[PDB]
Amino acid sequence: LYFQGAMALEEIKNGTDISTLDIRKFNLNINNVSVLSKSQSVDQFHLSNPHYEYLSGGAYPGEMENFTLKVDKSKKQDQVFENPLSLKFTNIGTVNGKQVDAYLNFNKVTLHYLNTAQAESEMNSAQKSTVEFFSISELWESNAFEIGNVPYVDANHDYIMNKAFWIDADVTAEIRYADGTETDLKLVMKPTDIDAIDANNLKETFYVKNYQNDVNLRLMNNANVLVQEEASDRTSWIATQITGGSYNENNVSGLALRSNSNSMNFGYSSTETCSAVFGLYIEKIDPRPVLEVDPAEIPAKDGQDVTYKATFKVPVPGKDILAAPSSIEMVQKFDERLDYKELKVESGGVTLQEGRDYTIEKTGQTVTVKMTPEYLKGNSSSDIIITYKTATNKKVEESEKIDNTVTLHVDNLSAPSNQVSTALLY
Ligand code: NA
């Protein structure tokens, strides 16, 4: 059942329109990327309005940072490039008041020799020297990077081989709070347009390593026609049909993945000539919970009432978050100098009931409200308001202020409220 899957990977296929999600796409571009390290195998260069695939090919407007791999032209056989490229995107957004950075590490890129005349010919030509694997641009989508073996070229960079090798890129993306605090963000990727199949039946493939342990939720639209291949070390999604237009690229040949963590070790393998475009995302809990405290200041002494009111906005399934919540919890932790007394929970002008609508777990100063499966089934959209009654205790006079924050949990997602404080007088 939907509400008793603790730990279990949750896979969903439903009518949600993946092309119209309202999730947050992080800012990733040629202007906030830096190369933390790259091996000498990597040929990196800037292009402006590059040509697609061939020099005589169409030219597309935009700045791009392009990355290729120098191959050993004598080895007409698979070539492996360990850790060729490690990237940081500095300040991809502000979330919950904190700067977030992205890390993108190419763990390995393997070039699989195509064993054709065309491949041998590129290998033997004196003008070709590198193979395409990665680029950063907004030619296709905003805030995106591109993995694939389709060359981008201009008059001075026409050395990239065509259809000599297909590529398999093993990549780890991670999002991280710059300030060093624990990153509670759950990375989301949304591969789309996984639809290329070449003359030789190679198929465009997106994959996730350690899928079963690393992914929290996987969303498909009813129209999905990818083949999901579950193997020991990974799960892959394999092209089966051409798809055009954002709706089809998203729903027919696409999917959404929410990680168990701030990172995901994914992969991508091309055909003799294809590529895919990617952003990094998170779901939205916006607004954050709104926390209030009455009063703003008290006499520093035992038995003084302090009351917290927390207003929780519930994310909208299929817009802010990928799907209806399996669980919603609100976690409060009171300053040592406070004794918890009791709480009430309200929604839609009505006073919800402990037992029917929510339960309460207390462990020391930590008090958690858990909404029941019965409440969640009602798919209510209205704010949940929790009012916590506490009173100072005999420890108040031991920080000349008592601070409070409450945290909303939706599945494995969380968002902290604003912090409030009550001044201690004397
Ligand atoms: Na397509």
Residue numbers in the entry: -6 to 0, 36 to 426, 429 to 456
The authors write:
The Sgo0707 protein consists of 1643 amino acids including a leader peptide, an N-terminal region, eight 84-amino acid repeat domains, five 88-amino acid repeat domains and a C-terminal domain containing the LPXTG sorting motif. Based on their related domain organization, our hypothesis was that the N-terminal region of Sgo0707 also represents an adhesive domain. Interestingly, binding to type-1 collagen was significantly reduced in the mutant strain. These data suggest that Sgo0707 plays a role in initial adherence of S. gordonii to type-1 collagen. Interactions between the wild-type strain and collagen-coated surfaces could be competitively inhibited using a recombinant polypeptide encompassing residues 36–458 of Sgo0707, suggesting that binding is mediated via the N-terminal region.
The structure of S. gordonii Sgo0707N was solved to a resolution of 2.4 Å by single anomalous dispersion using one crystal of SeMet substituted protein belonging to the I222 space group with four molecules in the asymmetric unit. The initial model was subsequently refined against native data to 2.1 Å resolution. The structure can be divided into two domains, N1 and N2, which both adopt β-sandwich folds with antiparallel β-sheets. The N1-domain is the largest domain (residues 36–311) harbouring a putative binding cleft which strengthens the original hypothesis of the N-terminal, non-repetitive domain, functioning as an adhesin. The pocket exhibits a predominantly negative surface potential formed by Glu81, Glu169, Glu174, Glu232, Asp221, Asp223, Glu277, Glu300 together with the polar residues Thr220, Asn278 Ser274, Ser303 and Cys302. In all four chains positive electron density is found in the cleft but this is more pronounced in chains A and D. Although the protein was crystallized without the addition of metal ions positive electron density, indicating a partly occupied metal ion was observed in association with Asp221 (OD1), Asp223 (OD2) and Thr271 (O) of the A-chain. Interestingly, the 1643 amino acid long protein contains only one cysteine, Cys302, and that single residue is located in the floor of the putative binding cleft in the N1-domain. To our surprise we found that the N1-domain, despite very low sequence similarity, exhibits a striking structural similarity to the variable domains of the AgI/II adhesins, also expressed by oral streptococci. Whereas the Sgo0707 cleft is predominantly negatively charged the AgI/II clefts are less charged and have a tightly bound metal ion. No isopeptide bonds are however observed in the Sgo0707 N2-domain and the residues in the equivalent lysine-asparagine positions are Leu319 and Asn434.
